[PDB]
């Protein structure tokens, strides 16, 4: 049947970037029409591949990752970037083959009091590896004395909330992001485009 791109792009709620979601796409027909013809995306950047030409290639599996960041940080969703998002939340490899799609979602993810449901990781001793997901909420020990699970001096909660508000400037507003990556294993190809049909 058709690949379920709609339930990724049109999901009611998105994940926080630190706990980014990933949908494994297999054994379906993928028509990328829906995406590249739709003039609804402020970001549609593809690497080592073209959207025009995806519809006639075959892959073993496709991964669709999705999360919310602020517009300021959409530039960090790219190969070779650094920054809090790239270093501690979601990391693309330098040889990334895929596409990065994003759109402004102020009308869905901002609240008047501030939406404190979307978070990002602020402290981490080392950078994530490509496609690594770290969902720890352990108190960050910034000094030598153990924190014993209590926030305080040199003991920081590792996550911070975006607090998206509709009044915010467009650099601070929430953006929904979908990252499509294409993997070619030594195995049969299960995700292709369409073509002609008999009867």
């Amino acid at each position: 049947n058709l690949c379920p791109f709609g339930e990724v792009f049109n999901a009611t709620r998105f994940a926080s970037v630190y706990a980014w979601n990933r949908k494994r796409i297999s054994n379906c027909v993928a028509d990328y029409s829906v995406l590249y013809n739709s003039a609804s995306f402020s970001t549609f950047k593809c690497y080592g591949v073209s959207p025009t030409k995806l519809n006639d290639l075959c892959f073993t599996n496709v991964y669709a990752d999705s999360f919310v960041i602020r517009g300021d940080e959409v530039r960090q969703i790219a190969p070779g970037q650094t920054g809090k998002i790239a270093d501690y939340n979601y990391k693309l490899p330098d040889d990334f083959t895929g596409c990065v799609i994003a759109w402004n979602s102020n009308n869905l993810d901002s609240k008047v009091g501030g939406n404190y449901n979307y978070l990002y990781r602020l402290f981490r001793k080392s950078n994530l590896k490509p496609f690594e997901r770290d969902i720890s909420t352990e108190i960050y020990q910034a000094g030598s004395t153990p924190c014993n699970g209590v926030e305080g001096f040199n003991c920081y909660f590792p996550l911070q909330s975006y607090g998206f508000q509709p009044t915010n400037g467009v650099g601070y507003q929430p953006y929904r992001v979908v990252v499509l990556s294409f993997e070619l294993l030594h195995a049969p190809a299960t995700v292709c485009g369409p073509k002609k049909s008999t009867n």
Partner: antibody, heavy 117, light 108 residues
């Protein structure tokens, strides 16, 4: 009890090099964001450089390519290597504990760098 | 590039009076504003972060308010220690920038 003590400032000719050092205690250097901020004589404050907890590095446009920030955790020391110095670089240089690349909650005492012929 | 403008440049008051210092931002920075205090020859000291939260050990007479492009630092009852230069700093957009400072002078 946080302590930061900068050292290494002095007179240098334009085009020369210097390495400032900041001896820190009361926290784990390798575990924190740290920044260098400078203040020209009688002028305001200008952020110079930052090292993230995870090791990433960022610089102000006026010093990009010439300055390099680094740390040594066993010595508990932060370093700023300045090359190809210009007259405009004359300032007191402050070492600072940086909370998540947002604000500077602990400052050293500063070290004076004079770049002149 | 966010430019911060502080007003007034100099403010002259007697000990015991209330001090009101203004920071204005060229763009919205929404709450990502900090205030620092600097006495002559000494290093700056963090007073307020998040536009309204006091740092550790800072007396209650220091308070911060505002948002977006307009911020205010108030000292309720001026003590002699409080006569210094005060700097606003924004961290809503890279690179972080400071205002040019407000000098608080003793009136006599």
């Amino acid at each position: 009890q946080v302590q930061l003590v900068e050292s290494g400032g002095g007179l240098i000719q334009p085009g020369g090099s210097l390495r400032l050092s900041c001896a820190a205690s009361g926290f784990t250097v390798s575990s924190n964001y740290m920044s260098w901020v400078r203040q020209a004589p009688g002028k305001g404050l200008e952020w110079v450089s930052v090292i993230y907890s995870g090791g990433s590095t960022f610089y102000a446009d006026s010093v990009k390519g010439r300055f390099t920030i680094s740390r040594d955790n066993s010595k508990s020391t932060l370093y700023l290597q300045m090359n190809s110095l210009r007259v405009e670089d004359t300032a007191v240089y402050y070492c600072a504990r940086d909370f998540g690349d947002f604000y500077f909650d602990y400052w050293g005492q500063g070290t004076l760098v004079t770049v002149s012929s | 590039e966010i430019v911060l403008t502080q007003s007034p440049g100099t403010l002259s008051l007697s000990p015991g009076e209330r001090a009101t210092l203004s920071c204005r931002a060229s763009q919205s920075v929404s709450s990502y504003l900090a205030w620092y205090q600097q006495k002559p020859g000494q290093a700056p000291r963090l007073l307020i972060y998040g536009a309204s939260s006091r740092a550790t050990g800072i007396p209650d007479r220091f308070s911060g308010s505002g948002s977006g492009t307009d911020f205010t630092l108030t000292i309720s009852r001026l003590e002699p220690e409080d006569f210094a230069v005060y700097y606003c700093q924004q961290y809503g957009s890279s690179p972080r920038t400071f205002g040019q400072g407000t000098k608080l002078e003793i009136k006599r």
